[PDB]
Amino acid sequence: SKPLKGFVICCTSIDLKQRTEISTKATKLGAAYRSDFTKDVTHLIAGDFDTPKYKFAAKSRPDIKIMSSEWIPVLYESWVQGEDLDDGLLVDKHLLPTLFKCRVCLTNIGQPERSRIENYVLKHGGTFCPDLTRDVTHLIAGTSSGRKYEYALKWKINVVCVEWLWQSIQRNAVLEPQYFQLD
Ligand SMILES: [Cl-]
Ligand SMILES: [Cl-]
Ligand SMILES: [Cl-]
Ligand SMILES: [Cl-]
Ligand SMILES: [Cl-]
Ligand SMILES: [Cl-]
Ligand SMILES: [Cl-]
Fold it and tell me: Domain named BRCT: which ranges?
């Protein structure tokens, strides 16, 4: 029984302990493992969007499935427990949310735009942040002015136009901020 025949798996933003567990179980399941992001990679297991590997997959590898860290351990346990593994291999259930680990704040944006943006952020696995804090990942700004904008620059927080959100959603992955800079 080799369920994951044809699968080539790579990890990013995963701790060594879980990474070893993943590589071990994935190999048992019949998959190939890669330390480097090579061409034959089919599945990227990610714990963050803010890595060279994730960014590469986002801009150049639309064919690659971005997976959550819990995919392999769950699939492996189901295998061992004698459960019948259906065609799909729990991939769809364990696809990483598009805005995983994104913490989105807004400025210079009115209603009902503000309400609609929050709607799509929550729907796609992100966190909405009414006030700006240092752990905010993206500030969506209508204009380049005001207290939030200035603190965003000072703290080196991504400042993007709303198109960042729409195209990240379309792509099913977080896109890099410079493509959506304010003019
Ligand atoms: Cl890693
Ligand atoms: Cl490798
Ligand atoms: Cl690499
Ligand atoms: Cl999603
Ligand atoms: Cl906000
Ligand atoms: Cl757009
Ligand atoms: Cl796209």
Answer: 1-89, 93-182
